[PDB]
Amino acid sequence: MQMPRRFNTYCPHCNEHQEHEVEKVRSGRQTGMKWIDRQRERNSGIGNDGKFSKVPGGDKPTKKTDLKYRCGECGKAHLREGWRAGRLEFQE
Amino acid sequence: ARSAYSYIRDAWKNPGDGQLAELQWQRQQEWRNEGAVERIERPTRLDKARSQGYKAKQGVIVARVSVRKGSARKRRHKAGRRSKRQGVTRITRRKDIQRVAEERASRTFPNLRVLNSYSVGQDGRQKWHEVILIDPNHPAIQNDDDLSWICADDQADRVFRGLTGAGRRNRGLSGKGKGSEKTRPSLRSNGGKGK
Amino acid sequence: GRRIQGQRRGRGTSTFRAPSHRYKADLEHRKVEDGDVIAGTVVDIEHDPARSAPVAAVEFEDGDRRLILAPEGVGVGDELQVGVSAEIAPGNTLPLAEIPEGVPVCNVESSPGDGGKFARASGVNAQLLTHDRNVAVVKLPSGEMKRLDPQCRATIGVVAGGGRTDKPFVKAGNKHHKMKARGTKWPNVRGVAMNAVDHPFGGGGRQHPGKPKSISRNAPPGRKVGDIASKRTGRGG
RNA sequence: UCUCAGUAUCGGGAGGAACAGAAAACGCAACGUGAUGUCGUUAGUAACCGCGAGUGAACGCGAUACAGCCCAAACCGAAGC
RNA sequence: GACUCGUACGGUCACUGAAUCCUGCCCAGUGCAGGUAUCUGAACACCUCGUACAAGAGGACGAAGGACCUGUCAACGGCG
RNA sequence: GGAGCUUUACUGCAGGCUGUCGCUGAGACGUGGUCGCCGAUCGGUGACUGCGACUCUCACUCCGGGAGGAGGACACCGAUAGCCGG
Ligand SMILES: [Cl-]
Ligand SMILES: [Cl-]
Ligand SMILES: [Cl-]
Ligand SMILES: [Cl-]
Ligand SMILES: [Mg+2]
Ligand SMILES: [Mg+2]
Ligand SMILES: [Mg+2]
Ligand SMILES: [Mg+2]
Ligand SMILES: [Mg+2]
Ligand SMILES: [Mg+2]
Ligand SMILES: [Mg+2]
Ligand SMILES: [Mg+2]
Ligand SMILES: [Mg+2]
Ligand SMILES: [Mg+2]
Ligand SMILES: [Mg+2]
Ligand SMILES: [Mg+2]
Ligand SMILES: [Mg+2]
Ligand SMILES: [Mg+2]
Ligand SMILES: [Mg+2]
Ligand SMILES: [Mg+2]
Ligand SMILES: [Mg+2]
Ligand code: NA
Ligand code: NA
Ligand code: NA
Ligand code: NA
Ligand code: NA
Ligand code: NA
Ligand code: NA
Ligand code: NA
Numbered sequence: 001m002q003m004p005r006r007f008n009t010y011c012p013h014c015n016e017h018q019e020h021e022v023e024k025v026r027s028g029r030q031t032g033m034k035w036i037d038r039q040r041e042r043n044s045g046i047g048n049d050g051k052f053s054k055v056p057g058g059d060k061p062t063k064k065t066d067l068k069y070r071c072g073e074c075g076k077a078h079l080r081e082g083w084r085a086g087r088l089e090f091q092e
Numbered sequence: 093a094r095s096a097y098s099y100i101r102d103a104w105k106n107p108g109d110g111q112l113a114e115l116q117w118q119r120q121q122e123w124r125n126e127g128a129v130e131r132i133e134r135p136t137r138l139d140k141a142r143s144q145g146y147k148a149k150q151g152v153i154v155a156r157v158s159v160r161k162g163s164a165r166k167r168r169h170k171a172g173r174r175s176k177r178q179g180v181t182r183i184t185r186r187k188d189i190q191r192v193a194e195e196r197a198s199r200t201f202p203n204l205r206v207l208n209s210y211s212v213g214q215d216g217r218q219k220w221h222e223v224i225l226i227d228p229n230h231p232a233i234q235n236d237d238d239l240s241w242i243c244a245d246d247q248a249d250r251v252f253r254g255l256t257g258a259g260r261r262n263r264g265l266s267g268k269g270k271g272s273e274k275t276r277p278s279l280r281s282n283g284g285k286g287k
Numbered sequence: 288g289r290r291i292q293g294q295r296r297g298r299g300t301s302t303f304r305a306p307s308h309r310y311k312a313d314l315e316h317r318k319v320e321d322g323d324v325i326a327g328t329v330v331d332i333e334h335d336p337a338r339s340a341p342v343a344a345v346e347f348e349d350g351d352r353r354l355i356l357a358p359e360g361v362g363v364g365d366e367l368q369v370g371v372s373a374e375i376a377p378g379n380t381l382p383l384a385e386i387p388e389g390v391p392v393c394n395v396e397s398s399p400g401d402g403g404k405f406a407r408a409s410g411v412n413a414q415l416l417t418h419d420r421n422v423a424v425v426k427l428p429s430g431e432m433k434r435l436d437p438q439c440r441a442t443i444g445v446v447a448g449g450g451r452t453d454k455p456f457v458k459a460g461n462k463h464h465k466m467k468a469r470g471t472k473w474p475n476v477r478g479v480a481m482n483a484v485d486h487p488f489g490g491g492g493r494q495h496p497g498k499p500k501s502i503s504r505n506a507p508p509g510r511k512v513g514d515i516a517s518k519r520t521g522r523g524g
Numbered sequence: 525u526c527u528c529a530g531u532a533u534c535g536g537g538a539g540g541a542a543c544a545g546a547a548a549a550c551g552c553a554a555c556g557u558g559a560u561g562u563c564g565u566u567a568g569u570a571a572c573c574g575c576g577a578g579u580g581a582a583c584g585c586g587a588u589a590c591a592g593c594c595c596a597a598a599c600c601g602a603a604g605c
Numbered sequence: 606g607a608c609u610c611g612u613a614c615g616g617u618c619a620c621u622g623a624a625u626c627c628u629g630c631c632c633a634g635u636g637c638a639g640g641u642a643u644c645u646g647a648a649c650a651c652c653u654c655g656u657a658c659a660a661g662a663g664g665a666c667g668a669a670g671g672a673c674c675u676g677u678c679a680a681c682g683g684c685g
Numbered sequence: 686g687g688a689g690c691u692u693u694a695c696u697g698c699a700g701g702c703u704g705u706c707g708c709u710g711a712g713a714c715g716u717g718g719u720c721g722c723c724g725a726u727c728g729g730u731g732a733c734u735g736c737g738a739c740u741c742u743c744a745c746u747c748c749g750g751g752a753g754g755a756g757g758a759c760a761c762c763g764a765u766a767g768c769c770g771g
Contacts (some may be wrong), residue, residue, distance in 0.1 A: 032661055043525075043573095046182060047175030048696055050525025051574045095597060117710090117744070124745095143596045149605070161707095162763045168699055176525075178698045195536085216708025216745090217762045232605060238595060245539075252537045268549045268559085273581060277544035277561060284530040288690080288771090293618075299607035313610035318750075337611060354610095394612095398748040398755070409614045429613050436748095436755070452614045457623095470608050471616085478619070483690055487771095488619080490690080497691095499681040500619065501637035505701040505769055513619045518638045519677040 005090045011071040012078050019072045022090070062086050097139035104137055107213050116213055123158065123220060129200040131155045136212050136222060144208035144224060144257075145239065151230030152239075153204060156212060156222045157193040186287060190258045191251075193221035198251045201225050205242050206251040209258060263287070288484040291509050292472070305470035310337045312354035315402025316380050316394070316440050317347070317369055324370030325349070329363050329378075336468050340409045340448035343378075356394045356407055358444025377444035383423040384437035386415055393446045395425060396439040403440070405433070410449025413441065478512060487512050 003022065011018045030037075040052050064082030071077070103112045119136075135141035135154050146152060163184040169177065185192075190209060198206045204225035212220040227233055228243040241247070250256060254263050264275030264286050274286040296303045311333070319325050327347035333354070335342040343357040345367060361367070361378045369380040375387060382399075386392060391412040394403035406413040406428055416432075417424035423437040456462045459474070466473040483490030487510060491497055500513035501520065514520055 029662075037661095045176070045525085046179035047177070047698080048525060053525080053696065054574080093598080097597075121744075139596085145595070160763085173698090174525095175697045180699065214708085215762095235605075241594090246542080248539090249537050253543085255538095255543085265544080268545090268547050270550085270582075272549095278542090281543075281561095296617095297607055303607060305607090305609060305611075307610065310610045315610095320750095321752080335610090337609085338615095340614090396748095400749050400754090404612060407612050407615085411612090411614060427613075428615090431613095438754075446614085449614070469616095470611075475619095477621085496620085496681070499636035501677090501680055502618090503637070503701085503769070507700040507770065510700090510770080511618080514637075514680065515618060516637070517677080517680075520637080520680045521678050523679095524632090524677055 001085055001087070002089050002091050005092045006072070009069070011074065011076075013076045014071060014074050018074075020069045021072055023068050023070070024088070025066045025068055095139075097142065100137055100139040104140070120213070120215055120220075123156070124215070126156075126158070129155050129157050129197055132222070135224075137210060140210045141222070141224060144210065146207070146224050147236070147239070149236070150232040151227035152233075153201065153225045153227070154222055155197045155200065155225065156220055157197050158218050158220055159189050159193045159196070160218050161189070161214065161216070186262075188258065188262050189219050190221055191254075191256070191262055193219075194223050194251050194256055194258060197223040197225060198249075203227065203229065205247060205249075206256050207239075207242065208256070291478075291486050291512065293512070294509055296472070303470065303472055305337070306468065309468070311335055312342065314342065314354060314356040314394070314407070316396070316400075316442075317351070317353065317355075318400065319370045322371060324368055324372040326366055326368050327351075329361060329365045329367060331363060332357065332361070338408065338448075339451060339465065339468070340446065356403065356442065357447045358393055358442055359410075359447045359449060360444065361447070375443060378442065380440055380442045382438050382440050383415060383425070383435060384418065386441065386443065388415055388418055390415055390443060391445050392425070392441040392443060395435070395441040397435070399436050399438040399440070403442070406446065408446060409451040410446055412445035415441070 006019055006021050008017050008019050010016075011020065043049065044052055062084045065085050065088055066082055067080065068077045069080060103110065107113065107116055132154050135146060136156070138146075141154065146154070163182065166180050166183050168180045190211070194206050194209050197209075198204065205228055207224040207226050209221050209223040212222050214220065226239060226242050228247070233239050234243050242250075247255070251259065254260065260266075263279055264272065266272075268276075274282040276282075279286040312335075314335075317325070325348060327345040329343050330346045330352070331344035332341050333344060335354075341357055342354045343361050344352065345355050346352045355367075358377050365378060367378045367380075368374055368376075371382060371385060373379045373381045373385070375381070375385075375390070380394075383392075383395075392415050393406045393412050395405040395413050396402065397404040405425075408428075411428040413428065413433075414426040415423065416426055419437065421437075423435045423439065425433045425435055427433050456465075462473065477494075478486035478488035479494045479496060481489035487498065488496045488500075496513065501517045502511050502513050502515055504516040
């Protein structure tokens with residue numbers, strides 16, 4: 001489905017309607033310094049690693065919309081509930 | 093002024109530098125052709141020996157002991173084991189090589205008790221330690237106010253009970269505070285969780 | 288499963304051992320002091336139960352009596368020589384350096400003074416090809432060209448008992464008697480005729496390997512069976 | 525993985541008890557405590573854990589009993605055993 | 606340490622199963638083996654960023670192995 | 686519920702192959718990098734190190750009764766990493 005790159009809507013920061021810009025959330029890089037990272041290294045050993053021997057996998061046929069709404073006035077972003085879309089394209 | 097002893101000490105801070113390095117490279121050649129346990133007439137590191145209680149005196153004995161480097165020489169499971177218990181390669185013994193050396197010396201000299209020991213270095217495949225042992229039955233020892241404690245019956249076979257300095261460190265008794273909850277007073281009274 | 292037969296072998300139990308106590312002599316070139324020769328007389332020819340090939344009893348000058356690996360054409364009363372200066376005749380042992388290129392040779396040392404290693408079995412020989420102050424080139428019975436120290440000693444001639452394998456055993460009994468004189472377990476049950484527990488090829492409702500026979504060099508014992516690290520198989524191609 | 529469990533069992537060894545023990549401690553942070561063991565408590569608390577099932581202290585406090593010392597080296601240098 | 610008081614006319618590891626006449630076609634998959642410009646390929650050391658240090662992020666280089674190429678069926682097997 | 690067996694089931698563990706560190710030393714070529722001193726970003730010059738190519742002997746290994754010989758900083762062994770591994 002298609003979506004406007006920009007449209008007016010409520011900014012929960014400004015607390016008033018503003019033109020927002022919408023973009024797909026790009027994944028941030030892991031630092032590898034998180035507690036879970038330390039736990040993986042510490043608890044892995046001879047034999048099976050328990051949860052750390054698991055291999056993640058699987059996909060729903062259609063993912064939910066994953067989006068940032070950024071105010072063109074105050075520059076801050078907010079998040080919204082997503083909805084299932086096989087494809088999401090922006091109209092500029 | 094500096095003792096002469098401080099010079100032996102200082103040399104041994106860096107066994108791979110200077111004259112000592114040359115010495116080791118020569119000596120080890122002879123050591124590799126020697127046995128498991130060799131009584132030596134004089135300590136290789138005199139400062140360390142005296143520091144540890146050695147005296148030049150009747151009933152004091154020094155012996156150099158060779159022990160293989162690395163991890164447990166371990167047989168693989170012959171019956172069912174969960175994966176955690178199936179290891180061979182990475183398993184290491186809980187007693188350090190130094191204590192192994194001390195036990196082997198003490199067995200060589202059944203009448204003698206282990207006072208202390210120290211490192212004389214290593215090649216790629218083995219480590220050497222010199223162990224100071226004491227004759228508890230010799231009256232030169234029995235009359236020495238500094239060493240006569242070792243003559244008491246309750247000091248019999250001290251090395252095999254972990255009462256040696258290397259024994260005590262290896263048992264986790266170094267700290268009197270935090271970290272010693274499961275070591276002091278003994279590994280066994282704490283249920284074998286200390287290490 | 289259970290350890291396979293090749294694994295039982297290594298344990299060195301009775302069934303797999305050579306009957307060593309029935310063996311006669313460990314055949315090695317006699318040691319000569321240096322820069323010398325030494326002579327002996329052939330006193331007898333006897334059977335070598337480890338080799339199914341004949342062996343020669345020699346009585347040497349210094350009084351020493353020992354069996355030696357006998358090339359063809361050696362007989363009682365013959366005089367044999369061992370050393371740098373020895374004559375070039377069948378049965379004499381010299382360093383490869385002193386031997387004429389193009390002469391057939393046997394009981395060749397791999398390293399100087401090792402008593403000899405190569406070309407010791409019935410009828411075989413090594414062919415000495417090239418000389419040098421550096422290297423002696425020898426062609427072994429397998430056809431391989433072997434670079435050797437010229438100080439490696441060899442015996443002149445081809446090993447005795449040639450043609451041993453020309454005659455078929457014809458029957459199980461004849462094999463049997465030979466196998467008693469060896470470090471082998473015999474007869475041989477096919478892996479494919481065994482149960483799965485007993486061999487990688489075991490099992491099934493009919494006899495067949497049930498996996499390719501060509502096995503990797505890296506395969507562990509108990510798995511390494513069939514055609515080991517084969518570069519090819521079959522006849523054609 | 526975890527759990528059963530550092531259990532069963534095995535190897536080595538001491539004593540009438542053993543081990544520990546006079547701080548490179550604690551860290552109710554202090555102008556405070558003052559070797560070690562044990563008992564009661566702190567507490568199923570902090571901490572661990574397919575953060576599942578389970579696992580699980582310590583400091584302190586109230587008690588019991590209390591005990592503090594010897595080398596190595598410096599400086600002497602055969603005065604010694 | 607067995608093989609081995611042994612040395613390729615030898616040992617080992619497998620398949621078939623005296624003699625006789627014979628034993629065709631297939632290397633795509635799988636296995637083994639060889640080669641490999643290029644691609645992929647870990648850790649140490651090395652370079653960059655980060656951190657007064659460290660965690661960590663990246664880079665360069667590139668072993669065996671793999672991709673790719675070739676050999677091989679009295680290899681696993683196949684012959685509609 | 687159990688066991689024996691199988692495999693391109695899941696997860697691991699031996700074993701084999703291979704890089705790397707230690708044992709582990711001397712000389713030296715090609716090249717590149719972090720670099721200091723002989724010069725007024727410009728070049729003769731320490732050391733360090735990436736890189737792939739080479740020679741020694743002195744550890745270590747094998748042969749030899751020995752004298753010595755063959756190897757040689759490799760291999761063995763210890764540690765670790767990747768691949769294969771019913
Ligand atoms: Cl989206
Ligand atoms: Cl003792
Ligand atoms: Cl045969
Ligand atoms: Cl307090
Ligand atoms: Mg693991
Ligand atoms: Mg006793
Ligand atoms: Mg107690
Ligand atoms: Mg021999
Ligand atoms: Mg035949
Ligand atoms: Mg007959
Ligand atoms: Mg037999
Ligand atoms: Mg058969
Ligand atoms: Mg059957
Ligand atoms: Mg099987
Ligand atoms: Mg059949
Ligand atoms: Mg068949
Ligand atoms: Mg559950
Ligand atoms: Mg527990
Ligand atoms: Mg505490
Ligand atoms: Mg079952
Ligand atoms: Mg299984
Ligand atoms: Na840990
Ligand atoms: Na003793
Ligand atoms: Na512990
Ligand atoms: Na089969
Ligand atoms: Na767990
Ligand atoms: Na094929
Ligand atoms: Na093929
Ligand atoms: Na069963």
